[PDB]
Subunit: 353 residues, 4 copies
Amino acid sequence: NLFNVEDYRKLAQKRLPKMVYDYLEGGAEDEYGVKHNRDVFQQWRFKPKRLVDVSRRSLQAEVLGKRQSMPLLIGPTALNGALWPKGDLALARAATKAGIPFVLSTASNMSIEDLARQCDGDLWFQLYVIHREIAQGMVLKALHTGYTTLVLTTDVAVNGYRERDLHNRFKIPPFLTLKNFEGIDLGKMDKANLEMQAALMSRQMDASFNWEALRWLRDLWPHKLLVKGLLSAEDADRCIAEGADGVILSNHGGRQLDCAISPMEVLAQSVAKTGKPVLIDSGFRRGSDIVKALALGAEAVLLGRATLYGLAARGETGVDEVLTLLKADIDRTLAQIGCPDITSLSPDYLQNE
Amino acid sequence: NLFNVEDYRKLAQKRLPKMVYDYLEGGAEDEYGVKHNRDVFQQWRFKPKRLVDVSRRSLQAEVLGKRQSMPLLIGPTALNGALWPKGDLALARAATKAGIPFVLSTASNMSIEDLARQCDGDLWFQLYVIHREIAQGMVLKALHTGYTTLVLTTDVAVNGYRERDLHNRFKIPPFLTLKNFEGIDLGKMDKANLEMQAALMSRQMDASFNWEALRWLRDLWPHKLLVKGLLSAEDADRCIAEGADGVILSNHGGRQLDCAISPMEVLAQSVAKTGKPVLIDSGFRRGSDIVKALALGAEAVLLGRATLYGLAARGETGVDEVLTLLKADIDRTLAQIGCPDITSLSPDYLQNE
Amino acid sequence: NLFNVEDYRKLAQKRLPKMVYDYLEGGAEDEYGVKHNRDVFQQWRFKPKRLVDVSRRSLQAEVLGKRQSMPLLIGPTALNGALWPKGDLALARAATKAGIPFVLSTASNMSIEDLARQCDGDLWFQLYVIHREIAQGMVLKALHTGYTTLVLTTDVAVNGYRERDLHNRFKIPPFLTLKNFEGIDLGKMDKANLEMQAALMSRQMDASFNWEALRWLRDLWPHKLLVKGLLSAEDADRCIAEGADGVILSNHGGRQLDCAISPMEVLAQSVAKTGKPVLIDSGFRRGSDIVKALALGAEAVLLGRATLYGLAARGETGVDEVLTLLKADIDRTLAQIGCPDITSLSPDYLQNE
Amino acid sequence: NLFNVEDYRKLAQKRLPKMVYDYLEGGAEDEYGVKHNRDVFQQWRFKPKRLVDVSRRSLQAEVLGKRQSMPLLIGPTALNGALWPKGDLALARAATKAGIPFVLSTASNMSIEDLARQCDGDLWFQLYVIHREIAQGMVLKALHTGYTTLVLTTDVAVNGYRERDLHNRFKIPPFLTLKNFEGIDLGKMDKANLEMQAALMSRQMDASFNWEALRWLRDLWPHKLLVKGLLSAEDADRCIAEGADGVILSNHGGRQLDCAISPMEVLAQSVAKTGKPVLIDSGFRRGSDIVKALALGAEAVLLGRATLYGLAARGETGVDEVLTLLKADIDRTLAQIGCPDITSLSPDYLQNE
Ligand SMILES: Cc1cc2nc3c(=O)[nH]c(=O)nc-3n(C[C@H](O)[C@H](O)[C@H](O)COP(=O)(O)O)c2cc1C
Ligand SMILES: Cc1cc2nc3c(=O)[nH]c(=O)nc-3n(C[C@H](O)[C@H](O)[C@H](O)COP(=O)(O)O)c2cc1C
Ligand SMILES: Cc1cc2nc3c(=O)[nH]c(=O)nc-3n(C[C@H](O)[C@H](O)[C@H](O)COP(=O)(O)O)c2cc1C
Ligand SMILES: Cc1cc2nc3c(=O)[nH]c(=O)nc-3n(C[C@H](O)[C@H](O)[C@H](O)COP(=O)(O)O)c2cc1C
Ligand SMILES: CCCCCC[C@H](O)C(=O)O
Ligand SMILES: CCCCCC[C@H](O)C(=O)O
Ligand SMILES: CCCCCC[C@H](O)C(=O)O
Ligand SMILES: CCCCCC[C@H](O)C(=O)O
């Protein structure tokens, strides 16, 4: 009796150990962030356009100039192998089966190569920078394995204060590890090489990464480059000014800064100012949420917890199911508001409440 | 201890099987739509005009130029025979006894003819278009049986995602059927005739019906024609531009698109722009709700669930009772705000909150 | 452990029979009116003026040109003898002991004369008009007994739909009666005289009373005349235009029209437009409520349920106690905001929220 | 499992006697004041500035021209010895260990001298004026003992109506006393000297203290002088006009006037109008609360209940812990919004909701 994302959340809570479930569902501090992420969608209602022929609908759209089955993506999330065996691959395959991209996390349980070898869909790589030299290693590693897009996540200068993990003394499941860091040499006692082991033993990343460093990364990567974690039209504009091909408005699903605004709050403005692809995530659970954002100008929406619920509850097939429902949900929504072609969405179909 | 519509809802929930009750009370998805439909009335409070002579009040009004006992109507609802034996007729008779119109649903359990034969009140016919040729059949059928008004419902291009029915695996009660489709030939193996049986086995309607198709219908029907399911002043204006004699602002009682705006949100504007009769429904339970809408310019309010509660709880007499209370409620309200003649209502008696 | 009005409400609910308690506490329909009456005070917060000498405070003020101990009044309420033995007199005496006026209801359990004989404080008479000739009888009766002010209540054209009384089949306690109507002749079979007995058997009043009738009353009464039940600056202005010496903004404590605006919503405007005394009631329970209204321009606040709780809980002494707390409450409030003289209150001490 | 201020509140409620806990946690009347104090922070969300180097952060700041480890202070609170043995000293020591000031209350359980002798951190003295001559005594007493700043609290002209203490018949713990008043002579039968004993037996202070009296105090004290308890930009401006070196916007933690606005409501304005140091308190529990205020222009935030929870729960170490968490909290917050130097905060990082 699995008819929406919520049903999968309930089912996942019943199958996951509290510690893992809390890792997944948890937010920062009081968790007003995740609640706000959901609430913000209620500030917009639909004003359907009647008597429009909607017998032939199309959810097909172009993201960064490349066509995909629908304006969605399974976003980068760490420790998927803790939610389900080989979670990273189960997701990549459901994404590929659905015709949409999958973004591998820097902190995945499967390596940039193992996935690229066991999957042929559109693969994106999300990069976290702990050590500058190590970052370049993964970047080229992903470049050689055929990853089409690179995504720099910037909202984790320091770790977010997530108390559920604190009360649970959460620990990365033993049978799992951060594969992308495995084999990163050692024994090399030079200094430089030592100044890397210190960062590898630090769950703390380079809080130093600035715009200048973005240029370094821009030159290093030849394909589409997106900056994730932006919460202002000003910052998205700067990113485009610095070479980015697009940005991802996001507050990390309310896991980093509890009082962070919802990316929906600066979406229309970012779209107007950048004049470039503005993707988004954080709070999306319903097809109506996704449509309101697409209607506001977003190029595509990335899914975080939504698809993870399908994974944690029923593995790969569970992810296929969540994507199938969401597509049908999105489809049904366009039909109701009278916008047969997903690419014709505009603020015209919305009403601010 | 039945003093308002709510009391009848409670009583109906106690008499109806959960499955049927959920079919009736249910809304789309999270059901924020039905809650919003109710909440929206709280955005307006009354500013009574004191020391006005209200010893002689009149609820009599003209709808589409024809006078009726009060600005109300029992709106078109499907499967009434599932709420109570011969529900369609029980309703038509309470409406006729109250001096207001009754709108027969395309998906009624009694046929366009049986009703027209067993009832002599003002009968309206709500049309759903599954098959163009079949639609014309009912249209003429209703025209010949003496139905005064035709109502094209446009907010069901595709079926609304109603999860209560999904969790219940709801099925149209065996002893009941969609009478208006009964006898629609068969055996005719021509192609055209086959391209109809496919639509008759589809709970899916012509998502193709556009403005051009509205013209076809406008020429086909010689009497008052109304378009139901509009949620924008722009669409109501277009309908009038295309021949409609009036429109029905409505979001289908929150059963089609959960995040749909309440028709109350575009009522004043639709009235100002169309300059034609603007009727409305969705959320009305109190006489105060009805009065606020009438005060905003609505020509009349159609009742959906309100009267269905009286029917499901106590059949025909139950409907008489709900109408009697609502009339008294409306009457008492005009007296309190100092507007003795229901036709003198204006935005003047309201205060936006 | 009786430190505020609420404590007395709780105590009264424990001593009163549910039927009587519901008669007292009840509101119209859903009772969103009484809740709104309370909520509306939260739209204003205090902006205290520091370093002001408040060692010598004065709550003394002039109402309609006559000085009283504080800007309060025990308002007219029907059936006080049902809340406590000789409730009307218990109240009049607490009011007189507190140095503020008491308004006798047309529907009191003690007569206009018995009170005027057993009490020497400032007595006001609230008039309800069932029969024009009978009204004049009480008016002169009160004039001869020495009542200083007359109050015409206009918000009861018809009776408010109060469902608590309906579910309880509420009936006026046997041992009690509407004394002011006792002895109003009979046996007189003339027609005119018969056209009075019909009104005396009707819990329904003259819904016909209009502005013209207000003139008749204005000429009939030589002293201060106030019109109670107004909810618009326009109506208060008209009343002054017609001779009234002041008005009482009120929605009858949410007992007549559930969706009625709170008189607080039109207080500032009524004060600005009338340029005459604007009194008010409906929802007042805290000294802060009273002060916000006085700060907005109100000349005085009338108490309804607040003092009735003291009466129902502990009779006369209970009323003395509620008044004592409210005075101390008001006093403490002026001290906190830095307005030592109650007559210096202005919108300056408020902040709209 | 003590990760935030709230955890300490819970722990303190478990260790404190209800009577003492209620004294601490209680507010005035309905306690909408303390709730509002918390709610008001939700009117602002963060708009982080990405790709900023935050690897080297600084919480160091100047308060009244003097540098301290962070923009915080343990504010003046009465009866600390009732929450924990020698609470005043436990607090002063945690403040001094944290590198921030401590403000001794006029009504402390340890004297102005005992503390100045047992502690060497930055000590401030909060003054309450019961008797003008007695006030001067403490003022000079604090001046000679080396207190750097004097703070005149003005929001206690009369005592706030706190019902928790009323229902509990709260009484100052026997083993404790108001040390700063101990030894204030007696036996002196002159008149003047008698006109002091009357004030010493009065939990009531000089409601007479006005601006003129502020001048007297301004001349008397040679160092930094701050006025606490202001709730308007106008009053803060007057204070500066009268000699104050800065002000403390505050509503006494919702303990004096329940409907008092939150100082956050007039913070930006007070900063713009005074052009002088504007400190603040009332409602602060999270680092995000503190940062929003600092971002709005506040020079520093004083802690009331937050640190008292650490004290009541675990004494001195408990206070060290609350301060340690709050510093880390503040630190983590600057990192997330991209403002490495606490002194660079501006309204730029905020979004009004
Ligand atoms: C368990 C979990 C792990 C995450 N790991 C990463 C990560 O490794 N890299 C990254 O850029 N974002 C990470 N995110 C953030 C997501 O990419 C995405 O922004 C967020 O989940 C969107 O919100 P939603 O979950 O409400 O859809 C994570 C989120 C969750 C819930
Ligand atoms: C059980 C049920 C069946 C319905 N069937 C129909 C139908 O056959 N045709 C149509 O035009 N609208 C249909 N509607 C919508 C109603 O005509 C009306 O717009 C709606 O009920 C108004 O909202 P309310 O129920 O809050 O009054 C139906 C509504 C309900 C609750
Ligand atoms: C039990 C009860 C009886 C009342 N009877 C009368 C009446 O006889 N005449 C009148 O003018 N108003 C009458 N009122 C209205 C009050 O005068 C007053 O407007 C109202 O109580 C104000 O609201 P509050 O109760 O919240 O203070 C009555 C109110 C209550 C609660
Ligand atoms: C138990 C308690 C005692 C207090 N005593 C004093 C005092 O002696 N002098 C003073 O100026 N303020 C006093 N205050 C007010 C505080 O200095 C401060 O303004 C307030 O606690 C700020 O709110 P918060 O508790 O939410 O942080 C007291 C507050 C509490 C909770
Ligand atoms: C708060 C520390 C987070 C460390 C890994 C980043 C990932 O985005 C996650 O939210 O779990
Ligand atoms: C969602 C499918 C609805 C099929 C019949 C239309 C009717 O309006 C109803 O809401 O039940
Ligand atoms: C609703 C009928 C009211 C009849 C008496 C008036 C009085 O104000 C009351 O509210 O009880
Ligand atoms: C309400 C009486 C307060 C007397 C001492 C002042 C102190 O600020 C406190 O709030 O306890």
